[PDB]
Amino acid sequence: FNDEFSQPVCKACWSGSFASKRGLPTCEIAQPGTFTNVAAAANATFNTATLIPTGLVKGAQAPTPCGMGYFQSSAETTTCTACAVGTYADQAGLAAC
Amino acid sequence: GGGVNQILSLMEDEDAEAAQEEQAIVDVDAEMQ
Numbered sequence: 143f144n145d146e147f148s149q150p151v152c153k154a155c156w157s158g159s160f161a162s163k164r165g166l167p168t169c170e171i172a173q174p175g176t177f178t179n180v181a182a183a184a185n186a187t188f189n190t191a192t193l194i195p196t197g198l199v200k201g202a203q204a205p206t207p208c209g210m211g212y213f214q215s216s217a218e219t220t221t222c223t224a225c226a227v228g229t230y231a232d233q234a235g236l237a238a239c
Numbered sequence: 240g241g242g243v244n245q246i247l248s249l250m251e252d253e254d255a256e257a258a259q260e261e262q263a264i265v266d267v268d269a270e271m272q
Contacts, residue, residue: 220245
């Protein structure tokens, strides 16, 4: 995402929100019914020695929906929660149980 | 894809479904009896 001008590199979205298309000024909200797990999703680190960024790695491009038997009621979430006892999740990507 | 690491026409139809359910229940109760 890049919500400002004169940026030598745009920041990778924080895990929860993801982005799919190219050149997106803002991250896209992970709608309820999915999750976004990623490790190397850290905005680059401008070293003071040469004022240059480095070490940027992109986040999750895809929505990567919540597998079967696992739901996510809340949006902007990294992990997927198991459906409670007594209720079922029939298909992957279910908003709630 | 192997995944990551880890209104007016809605309730009017839901009431119709909940009325067809009651009709089916009455139909089932009238046959066993």
